[PDB]
Structure 1
Amino acid sequence: DNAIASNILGITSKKIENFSDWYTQVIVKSELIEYYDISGCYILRPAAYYIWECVQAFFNKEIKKLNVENSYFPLFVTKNKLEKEPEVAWVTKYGDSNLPEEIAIRPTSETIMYSVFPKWIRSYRDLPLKLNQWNTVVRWEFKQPTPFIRTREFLWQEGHTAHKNEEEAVKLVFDILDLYRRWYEEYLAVPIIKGIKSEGEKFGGANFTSTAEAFISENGRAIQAATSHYLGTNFAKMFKIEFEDENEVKQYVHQTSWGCTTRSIGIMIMTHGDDKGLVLPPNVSKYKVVIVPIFYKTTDENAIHSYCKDIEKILKNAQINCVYDDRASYSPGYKFNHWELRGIPIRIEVGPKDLQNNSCVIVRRDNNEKCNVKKESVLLETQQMLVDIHKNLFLKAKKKLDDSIVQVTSFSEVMNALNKKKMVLAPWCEDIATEEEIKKETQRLSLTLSGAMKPLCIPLDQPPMPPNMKCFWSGKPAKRWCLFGRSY
């Protein structure tokens, strides 16, 4: 429990050698996650919840442009109402007395909301209806949990809309999907692959499911990053959500729903984190800069302290939040590891020579590259470097994603691509019967998580398909290229 020894040790598992232990150490030592006495439930500490507040402000600002309004619906669903559509958590008593009708924690708010929609929708003048919630949902599974990405309770947003026809809803589905892209690219520097889910992997209530897929290249696992469904009139028939149209004729509404969870944070940690600890894209880090003082003698102490307070004022006047670790009990080297492990994008060092030159040293977190900068240039160099740190993080990640995809044309090359922690891009006939056949065979040939291969998504960005190409599995005419891989 010695501070210096713990500081020098940092993360002690190498990301590439022991990924599972590497991930646990990072989330605990960078002060993101705390554990709890109920399995599969975790505490979001400030540094983690700050990230959620950043993406929440962005997604709010964007869905307002689509005229989507936030709201809040009850945490509880009556058994009577939920079972009008079996791992839900059930409230059965208050104090010591049983409830006459059991009560479920929402796993999602479909039945809670769509049950009231008919009261709000009477004619076309009431459409479209566009609602969003920021809440938690509970799903009591006994699979092995994993912080951020696979938990019994998790924070998310769920948005639900209803439209007068199909095209206006289908357009909204993909408009939201691109906001999920920007959520991951512009804020978490994580590249995703837009696609359509296979028939066997889509949401049971949707006509189609569009998805944003991410890939964890260190363990070879694909993970769904966000989702956006076109529900059609399926839920309008269940709940009788009708309206009178412009011709005075009763019609069903066309609905969409879409969500993104704190799994996005987990994906971001697994992408950018290195053997030093957390690595934060500037847009989700509270402190963009850490100012560390360095003292050669005891005489230059009052000057360097004042010089660091000048740089702090320069950055904070430009609304660039920072922190000046003026603690006298720790060495500069200690502070370097301290804030590197916590993922601060930029470190500014001020020493005696840097003060004699009226300059400073600015170190990047992603690649540890240093450069000397004049004091009057500190603000401009910091601004451009925060932008380049993001771009570098994203481009390096997009490289790892692209290199994780092996385009194949026969099944005889599938197992070799899987065992190299990759996913295959294969031409597929999209027949639903083949989805389980591919799972059973890929896991059979694999010799804890599963070894089976499942249809991840059919990408929107389709490679050229020669009109005579056949399915990599059945040999029947192929329809589109499909990503297949191992998942959680």
Structure 2
Amino acid sequence: AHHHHHHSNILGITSKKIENFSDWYTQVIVKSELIEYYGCYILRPAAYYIWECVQAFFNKEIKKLNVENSYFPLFVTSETIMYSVFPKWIRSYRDLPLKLNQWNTVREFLWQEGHTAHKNEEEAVKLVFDILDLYRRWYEEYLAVPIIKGIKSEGEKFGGANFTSTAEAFISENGRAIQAATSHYLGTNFAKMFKIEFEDENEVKQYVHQTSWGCTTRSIGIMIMTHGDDKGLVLPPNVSKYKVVIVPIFYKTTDENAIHSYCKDIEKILKNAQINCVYDDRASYSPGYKFNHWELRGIPIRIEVGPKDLQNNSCVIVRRDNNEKCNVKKESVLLETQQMLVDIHKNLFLKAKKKLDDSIVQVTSFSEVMNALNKKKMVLAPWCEDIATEEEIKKETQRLSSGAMKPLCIPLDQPPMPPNMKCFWSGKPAKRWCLFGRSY
């Protein structure tokens, strides 16, 4: 029977995140046991657990908004056959609002999409932004990922939408923006197509006002790209099944019982407090092997117990995000573990938010744009918002370079627009600031 002292190089991540991002990413998602390639792939329990966590959150919150889950099995190329059925369900204002959500399966295999119909515009638009903030919370509170809320340009919004609001994320390592979630105000467009009308409170016939919104497992990919490091997966505590791994350290059989017993004590303390954890008591693997093994898998906290800790009635607690270590007295393990899990999430989010902030360069002229893109940034630019310019900006940025930059979103949070500020592209008067970047 073989003892494994050293976790071999090949079993760890062999590509650095900064030097080979694409290979780094595929190594992390497979070697961390998130997915298994069969170009389709399987969501193993560690991946599905993340989805199930954000699913539970989102379900709870949309039910407070009276959204009802449902399942519509018929799709067309991808969109759900649905709106043509709405006239069968809506005749008067008493039938409104209609609020539906579906959890679907099908490069991303799972997603959520919601659809609503309202008696007026203001209700529909309120819901669009309520859902958009729920997506902010999905990303921030669970995935520790910062996003930017905004409105898509006319050229990039959904064709059937009056406007498309979006949550935008940014992958700093390769300078790529990514649409993180979307929430559309569809106006009366589909109501006119399918005669989705109702008798209002004044006995006047009206069209319904619709919304739709969705988010996919892309969210998990964004999270991994954000927090992952050269040791592998890094998980916000809220989406890791095990919060803590306990690793026994001993080399003499005379220490085995006391170390094992003490580790079980700590395991009991945590699990009794509803903090799930794993005690890795495998005899065939060294402590050092186990350190690497569980870092690769993204466990937020490691607790080490060796003979020194027995003698000091302590233990060593190591954080996955920054590898900082501290000695903790046994009776303090529960509280310090609770506080550390909170601090790990806060640190993950704040570090990511700083990187997002530093990824945005405010420009006023197109001459500043290429320098920005090559530093893997996106730009915030004053823009006339003329739809014709969108393809012109893309084509030119492609030329001066998949290389092109496109309008990402017009952020809800707008800096002041100086009185005479011109469009960075057309020279025409600028209207608002818009984010532009290379994208997925």
Contact 2:164 2:184 in 1 (8 A): yes
| Contact 1:470–1:477 under 8 Å retained in 2 | yes
Contact 1:8-1:334 at 8 Å conserved across structures: no
For residues 313-361 of structure 1, the C-alpha deviation after alignment (integer angstroms, 9 at most, x for no partner) is 1000111000000111111001000000000000000111101111111
Out of 49, 73, 88, the position equivalent to 1:119 is: 88
Matches of 1:72 and 1:454 in 2, distance apart? 35
* Structure 1 residues 400 and 247, CA gap change in structure 2 (3 angstroms): same
Distance 1:233-1:15 versus aligned 2 partners, 3 A rule:
same
Secondary structure in 2 aligned to 1:194?
A: strand
Give a deviation string over 1:98-130, Cα, whole Å, max 9, x none. Answer: xxxxxxxxxx88551112111111100011010
1:340 counterpart SS class? helix
* CA 7–330 in structure 1, closer or farther in 2 if over 3 Å, else same: farther
Cα distance between partner residues in 1 of 2:439 and 2:95: 41
Inter-CA distance 302–8: structure 2 relative to 1 (3 Å threshold): farther
Separation in 1, partners of 2:193, 2:156: 22
Q: TM-score, normalised by structure 1?
A: 0.87
Deviation (angstroms), 1:26: 0.4
Q: Whole-Å Cα distance in 2 between the matches of residues 245 and 52 of structure 1?
A: 40
Matched ranges for 1:224-243 at <5 A = 224-243=179-198
Higher relative contact order (CA 8 A, sep 6+): 2
CA distance in 2, matches of 1:355, 1:409: 63
Distance of 2:108 and 2:64 partners within structure 1: 30
**Contact 1:184 1:264 (8 Å CA) reproduced:** yes
Q: Distance in 1 between matches of 2:5 and 2:46?
A: 21
CA contact (8 A) 1:296 1:352 kept: no
What per-residue deviation string (whole Å, max 9, x for no partner) do you get for residues 243-275 of structure 1? 000011110000000000000000000000000
- Aligned 8 A contact 1:41 1:153 in 2: no
Q: Cα deviation per residue 1:71-119 (whole Å; 9 max; x = unaligned)?
A: 111145xxxxxxxxxxxxxxxxxxxxxxxxxxxxxxx885511121111
CA distance in structure 2 between the aligned counterparts of 1:6 and 1:125, rounded to whole angstroms: 66
Q: d(CA) in 2 for partners of 1:444 and 1:375?
A: 62
In the aligned structure 2, how far is the partner of 1:75 from the partner of 1:317? 46
Q: Is the 8 A contact 1:7 1:337 kept in 2?
A: no
| CA–CA distance in structure 2, aligned partners of residues 178 and 281 of structure 1 | 20
Distance 2:78 2:243 in 1: 37
Alpha carbons 1:225, 1:260 under 8 Å: kept: yes
Shift of 1:296: 3.9
Match of residue 133 from structure 1: 102
Q: Given the superposition, is the C-alpha separation of residues 455 and 3 from structure 1 closer, same or farther in structure 2, using an over 3 Å criterion?
A: farther
Instruction: Give the distance between the partners of 2:403 and 2:10, measured in 1 at CA.
Output: 38
Q: Are the counterparts in 2 of residues 8 and 337 from structure 1 also a CA contact under 8 Å?
A: no
Distance 2:138 2:108 in 1: 22
Q: Name 1:265's counterpart in structure 2.
A: 220
Please tell me whether the aligned partners of residues 390 and 406 of structure 2 are also in contact (alpha carbons under 8 angstroms). yes
Separation in structure 2 between the aligned mates of residue 300 and residue 162 of structure 1, nearest angstrom: 67
Q: Secondary structure at the match of 1:347?
A: strand
- Select which of 428, 431, 435 maps to 1:483: 435
Other structure's SS at 2:132 match: helix
Name the SS of the counterpart of 2:81 in structure 1.
helix
The 8 Å contact of residues 382 and 421 in structure 2, kept in 1 or not, is answered as yes
Post-superposition Cα deviations, 1:265-297, rounded to whole Å, max 9, x if no partner, equal: 000000000000000000000000000000142
2:6/2:286 contact within 8 Å kept: no
Inter-partner Cα distance in structure 1 for 2:173 and 2:9: 26
Q: Distance in 2 between matches of 1:332 and 1:17?
A: 29
Aligned to 2:132: 177
Deviations 1:422-461 (A, max 9, x none): 0000000111011011011111111xxx111100000001
Consecutive unaligned residues in structure 1, runs of 5 or more: 77-107, 136-150
Distance change in 2, residues 1:3/1:294 (3 Å) = closer
Q: For residues 419 and 330 of structure 1, what CA distance do their matches in structure 2 show? A: 45
| Shift of residue 310, structure 1, vs aligned partner | 0.7
Change (3 A) 1:152 1:352: closer
Distance (Å, rounded) in 2 between the aligned partners of 1:393 and 1:152: 26
CA distance in 2 between partners of 1:456 and 1:353 (Å): 55
| Structure 2 contact 5–286 (Cα < 8 Å) conserved | no
Identify unmatched segments of 5+ residues in structure 2. Answer: none
Question: Take 1:294 and 1:75, find their aligned partners in 2: how far apart are those partners?
Answer: 56
For the 8 Å contact 1:7–1:338, the answer to whether it is kept is no
1:362-404 Cα distance to aligned partner (Å, 9 max, x none) = 0000000001111111100000000000000000000111100
Secondary structure of 1:13's match? coil
Q: Flag the 1:354–1:152 CA change in 2: closer, same or farther, 3 A.
A: closer
Q: Is the 8 A contact 1:309 1:324 kept in 2?
A: yes
Displacement of 1:34 after TM fit? 1.3
* Residue 21, structure 1, aligned to residue 20, structure 2: no
- Superposition CA RMSD, Å: 1.4
Once the two structures are TM-superposed, the CA of residue 41 in structure 1 deviates from its matched residue by 2.1
Cα drift, residue 6 of structure 1: 3.1
Distance in 2, matches of 1:158 and 1:43, equals: 21
Whole-Å Cα distance in 2 between the matches of residues 241 and 4 of structure 1?
66
How far the C-alpha of 1:8 sits from its partner, in A, is: 7.3
Q: Identity rate of aligned residues, in percent?
A: 99
Q: 1:240 Cα shift?
A: 1.1
1:331 is aligned to 286
In the alignment of these two chains, the number of paired residues is: 435
Post-superposition shift, 1:153? Answer: 5.2
Distance 1:371 1:288, change over 3 A: same
Residues 359 and 374, structure 1, Cα contact 8 Å, conserved in 2: yes
Contact 1:190–1:398 (CA<8 Å) still a contact in 2? yes
